[PDB]
């Protein structure tokens, strides 16, 4: 609910289906602690990662396993993964969508942050 | 149903709301004929542009009125509009989403084409 | 010199070489008048389109022939071209670089505008 | 020379000047070892990070300090940095250009890889 990830494929013109996504939260010692993870659905979307209670302010990293995605399609990739690192700030009610558009040698990412 | 447009704002991190979108189909004389149009909703989406019966194969242009969008936000823009020109090809059942991510001096667009 | 175009290939991670580019300028009767054209070099760059004298104020359209590029690589892409439409030199001469990043179902474009 | 970084600003339509960039290389114990760092110039480019001798095969992370860039412009952005993680030189030396296009809530990155 508070955090959704959506992944699209710029080569095939499709959702990026069955992509592994890991979310980490930065710990006090500056290490990355696993927070949530899953695989994108047939729509390219990954829902249900966290809850309002669990998602507190902090620094988060979303790692999208793009290399494995491209390899499963038989397409030669450049990156190991796509990484999105951001701060969650409580500024009234907010829902976050982290969206990524994947190509073999490029990616784009945006945040769509809305007030429900 | 067969054609949806979605527009996002990379500066504000939001859907691009109330953006005018025009769709044209290329005529035999190479001119662009108005085909459908509307304004994006609060989700950034524009549904209901056309019907399965009306949307035939051909060359289409989607013009997204980005300059007016940025001006309404008080942000100085570069482009007059964003233009997406593509061929619709009947290759089994297909639904098209034309998505765009807007910045003042840049835009990105992709097509998400799925079989319902 | 005042107008340069650069095109990159997001599948191969390379310059997009031998891409045709056509520049138009909106005429007083609202038609698109041919202005300049050329092909990208081995670096993906297209220099020498115009001159300071010829590049007057106006609304310009840069059409990048992405479909012909993909077809030459044996790929059937989604878009016919990538189009960049902008007002130029409205506050005196500027140098414009129009850059594009290509995938079969997506493109991104940015402008870099500098004052000499 | 073998590794160059270029950063552009999609709000202003300009090179992103004075952007800090830190490159790491994955060590045999799976930690990220510092490798090279620098700042983009007035053209948005960062040359001279490394040498052919030092740039061995490995997994590299290029961290572009986008938050510090935006904060210096008086903007509160979404991301902490932009991260580009890739295996380099796996089939012999290549020249890599890592390019990034920045907005407050989005970034795009591409790689241009050439064989000398
Ligand atoms: C089809 O549906 C969607 C598509 C897209 C995108 O195509 C998109 C994704 C990332 C980037 C950096 C840029 C683009 C244009 C995002 C969406 N979303 O809701 O953010 C979305 O729903
Ligand atoms: C003006 O000069 C350059 C521009 C650009 C880009 O505009 C570009 C950058 C990132 C992305 C994701 C997409 C785009 C189109 C890249 C360059 N390069 O060498 O990669 C370059 O030289």
Numbering used by the authors:
A (entry chain A), B (entry chain A), C (entry chain B), D (entry chain B): 10 to 125
What does the report in the manuscript say about this coordinate set?
The native tetrameric structure of TTR is a dimer of homodimers related by a 222 symmetry. Each pair of twofold-related monomers forms the hormone-binding site, a central cavity at the dimer-dimer interface, crossing the entire complex, which is lined with two sets of three hydrophobic halogen binding pockets (HBPs) where the iodine atoms of the bound T4 molecules are harboured.
The crystal structure of the TTR/2 complex, determined at 1.10 Å resolution, confirms, similar to 1, the “forward binding mode”. The 2-fold axis running through the binding pocket generates two symmetrical binding modes of the ligand, which are rotated by 180 degrees in relation to one another. The Fo–Fc electron density map at 3 σ level clearly defines both the 3-methoxy-4-hydroxy-5-nitrophenyl ring and the innermost apolar 2,4-dimethyl-phenyl ring, and the two binding cavities are equally occupied (0.50/0.50). The 2,4-dimethyl-phenyl ring of 2 is positioned deeply in the inner hydrophobic binding sites HBP3, sitting between Leu110 and the γ-methyl group of Thr119′ side chain on one side and Leu110′ and the γ-methyl group of Thr119 side chain on the other side, with the 4-methyl group of the 2,4-dimethyl groups pointing towards Ser117/Ser117′ and the 2-methyl group of the 2,4-dimethyl groups pointing towards Ala108′-Ala109′. The 3-methoxy-4-hydroxy-5-nitrophenyl ring remains in HBP1 and is held in place by hydrophilic interactions with Lys15/Lys15′. The positive charges of Lys15/Lys15′ are counterbalanced by carboxylic groups of Glu54/Glu54′ at 2.87 Å. In this study, the X-ray structure of TTR bound to 2 reveals distances of 4.5 Å between chain A/A′ and 5.0 Å between chain B/B′.
